[PDB]
Amino acid sequence: ELIKENMHMKLYMEGTVNNHHFKCTSEGEGKPYEGTQTMRIKVVEGGPLPFAFDILATSFSYTFINHTQGIPDFFKQSFPEGFTWERVTTYEDGGVLTATQDTSLQDGCLIYNVKIRGVNFTSNGPVMQKKTLGWEAGTEMLYPADGGLEGRSDDALKLVGGGHLICNLKSTYRSKKPAKNLKVPGVYYVDRRLERIKEADKETYVEQHEVAVARYCDLPSKL
């Protein structure tokens, strides 16, 4: 098939957070049908970043979700054309980060092109002060909306001192195939655990791992 048991990826990211410009690149690999993946990330312009790398972590890969129980897989079905994602992330203490991503497949390698714009982060808040300690595991709900899918989650960012900062994610997923080799699923959920494995040099080198598994809701139904 086009999405093999093992797949590699390359990513290019550019953006600005509170008017601080940066670029990142990454390379990695994963098992798309197991829902696991690793990325080795470099900040290649604008490093060291004057803000928590964690706010970028969820912008570095939907092809690597284990879609269990035969859930129609909008992402894997989109190849060879690929798909795009876009998102607004709203932090409860003010910051808003928008992201646009193109996912393509080129000579057997997944290629990600991501652009990020973050504004209104409080200068003495935990993001700008680099007082974060990674993400809690989380659940995204995905549902069909306008010949595509949308997604929603509320995620918890760990803070120095043991607290959490919550943000809300609203995503839209659009296939580059025009619904002709694409079966779109019903409402479903993706459970994820994204972990930072290594970092060096003021977060200008970061290794990240994610496991992501899609599921219907299991619970018994009276109807």
Place of tokens 């992201």: 99
Rounded CA gap, 208 and 43, in Å? 14
What is the CATH code for 1-223? 2.40.155.10
Rounded CA gap, 128 and 55, in Å? 10
Give me the residues paired with residue 141 across strands: 152, 189
Residue 218 phi, psi (nearest 5):
-65, -35
The count of C-alpha atoms lying within 13 angstroms of the C-alpha of 14, restricted to the half-sphere facing its C-beta, is 2
Which two three-digit tokens encode residue 186?
């019903």
Burial of 12 from C-beta contacts in 10 A (0-12 / 13-18 / 19+)? middle
Amino acid at 40: R
Give me the residues paired with residue 89 across strands: 97, 169
Compute the C-alpha angle 108/114/118, nearest 5°. Answer: 165
In this structure, the strands spanning 20-31 and 7-17 are antiparallel
Q: Which of 101, 109, 124, 131 is nearest to 15 (CA)?
A: 101
Place of tokens 């479903």: 188
DSSP secondary-structure letter at 56?
H
Rounded CA gap, 76 and 94, in Å? 35
**Sign of the torsion angle spanned by Cα atoms 47, 53, 58, 63:** positive
Q: Which of 129, 131, 119, 9 is nearest to 61 (CA)?
A: 9
Residue 100's CB is within 10 A of a number of other CB atoms, namely 15
Residue 218's CB is within 10 A of a number of other CB atoms, namely 8
Helix ranges (DSSP H) in the chain: 54-57, 74-77
Give me the residues paired with residue 55 across strands: none
Rounded CA gap, 151 and 76, in Å? 17
User: Length of the chain in residues, anyone?
Assistant: 223
Give me the residues paired with residue 149 across strands: 144, 173
Rounded CA gap, 84 and 114, in Å? 10
Residue 94's CB is within 10 A of a number of other CB atoms, namely 12
